Design a protein around this nucleic acid. Structure first.
Ligand SMILES: Nc1ccn([C@H]2C[C@H](O)[C@@H](COP(=O)(O)OP(=O)(O)OP(=O)(O)O)O2)c(=O)n1
Ligand SMILES: [Ca+2]
Ligand SMILES: [Ca+2]
Length: 426
DNA sequence: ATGATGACGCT
DNA sequence: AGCGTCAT
């Protein structure tokens, strides 16, 4: 139990666009539609680096971080769109703008947290209560959930994918107690009805398809989203967690895909998320720190309290370019010229941002990488007082020039990064 | 060695 | 403040 919390207090969705940069290019160029295709940055080196891949091309084994020339070996008919190039660098404006299209539609339904260029979390708790006030006690038909998967179902007593989806959904809805407006499962179900609507509106008004996850917190909603991609949505109930987590590799859960997840596996000698339940909160805290330990203890039971933050715009605006291998900047003149190119794109994006969103950045963060992967090697800041490219590139040079151990610059820089931050209204 | 981003934690 | 981790 009567005093044990179960993490069923919210309805949270994570919406993520399907092969996003590819859809943006396919909307614009109908020849690319329903074909194996990919988006590449640059062209000179091995046909360019693949940044995004349609599902038709994934069926040939093509992935991101492949060189286009190598992708062609797996998929000879592969079609390519390339990222716009401005001032000698890749420019993502087209995708940032398509992103705004989608975010503004989602923001009509509820408060969103912009999680990336093509993903947003939604807290649907209030919206769900609303929809439950209307539809006073009346059944939810499977027709309101035409693309929803219920994770863990069907169980017990078809041969095709859509057959299985529906069988599971029928089992789910048949068991659903609609007379209790406090039922966590009913609330998730209504949550999923709203997300069907949201996803319909996105596709109607933009042409873009997406997937979604619906559950009681962000981590489960994110996990749920990727269970049935593309163009589908997945409901992960509290009750589904023990079986789902029982064979779920630790690295699949958000924030456990890197070093901490590896420590968890190595120190505890476990593989799957469910196995974490057999450790006390104190043991987990002793191994991984108080915050991580408490987080892990709750999370392996499907419980997480990270709030959906009310934030629709990025908190930073940055411009970055890598200079790998022989292309690494070796002279002072090069460093200054590329700082200028970056500052000019940055100035362009800052002026737009100020006009649109009534805010101004006050700090300029300058970050470089040295040949050989020193320490980002180095990060320094200065005041951003004027949206002026020549001043910003000059200031950035001023704060990094001391790092030169040499007309010549050594060690060669393999990356430059300018980032505007610490925004104030207006 | 996708190269281009973005959010947040630690000290 | 500057570096590290984790992710799209
Ligand atoms: N390391 C990465 C990962 C992604 N992206 C870009 C290209 C993607 O189209 C977009 C969204 O990334 P996702 O990881 O969501 O991948 P997609 O949306 O392309 O595919 P999926 O349908 O698997 O989400 O961000 C990128 O530039 N660099
Ligand atoms: Ca995506
Ligand atoms: Ca994404």
């Amino acid at each position: 139990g009567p005093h044990m919390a179960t993490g069923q207090d919210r309805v949270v969705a994570l919406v993520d666009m399907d092969c996003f940069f590819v859809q943006v290019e396919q909307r614009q160029n109908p020849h690319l539609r329903n074909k194996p295709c990919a988006v590449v940055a640059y062209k000179s080196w091995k046909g360019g680096g693949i940044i995004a891949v349609s599902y038709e091309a994934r069926a040939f084994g093509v992935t991101a971080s492949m060189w286009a020339d190598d992708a062609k070996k797996l998929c000879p008919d592969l079609l390519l769109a390339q990222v716009r190039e401005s001032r000698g660098k890749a420019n993502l404006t087209k995708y940032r703008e398509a992103s705004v299209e989608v975010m503004e539609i989602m923001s009509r339904f509820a408060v969103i947290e912009r999680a990336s260029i093509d993903e947003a979390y939604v807290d649907l708790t209030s919206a769900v209560q609303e929809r439950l006030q209307k539809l006073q006690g009346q059944p939810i038909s499977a027709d309101l959930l035409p693309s929803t998967y219920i994770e863990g179902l069907p169980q017990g007593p078809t041969v095709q994918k859509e057959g299985m989806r529906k069988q599971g959904l029928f089992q789910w809805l048949d068991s659903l107690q609609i007379d209790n407006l406090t039922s966590p499962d009913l609330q998730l179900t209504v949550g999923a009805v709203i997300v069907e609507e949201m996803r319909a509106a996105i596709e109607r008004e933009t042409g873009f398809q997406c997937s979604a996850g619906i559950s009681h917190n962000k981590v489960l909603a994110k996990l749920a989203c990727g269970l049935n991609k593309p163009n589908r949505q997945t409901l992960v109930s509290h009750g589904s967690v023990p079986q789902l987590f029982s064979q779920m590799p630790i690295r699949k859960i958000r924030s456990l895909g890197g070093k901490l997840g590896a420590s968890v596996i190595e120190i505890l000698g476990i593989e799957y998320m469910g196995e974490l339940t057999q450790f006390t909160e104190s043991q987990l805290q002793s191994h991984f720190g108080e915050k991580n330990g408490s987080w892990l203890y709750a999370m392996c039971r499907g419980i997480e309290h990270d709030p959906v933050k009310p934030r629709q715009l990025p908190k930073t605006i940055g411009c970055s370019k890598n200079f790998p291998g022989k292309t690494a900047l070796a002279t002072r003149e090069q460093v200054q010229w590329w700082l200028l190119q970056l500052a000019q794109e940055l100035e362009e994006r800052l002026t737009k941002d100020r006009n649109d969103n009534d805010r101004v950045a006050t700090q300029l963060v300058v970050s470089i990488r040295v040949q050989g992967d020193k320490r980002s090697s180095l990060r320094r800041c200065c005041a951003l007082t004027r949206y002026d490219a020549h001043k910003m590139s000059h200031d950035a040079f001023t704060v990094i020039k001391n790092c030169n151990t040499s007309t010549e610059w050594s060690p060669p820089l393999t990356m430059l990064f300018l980032c505007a931050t610490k925004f104030s209204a207006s």
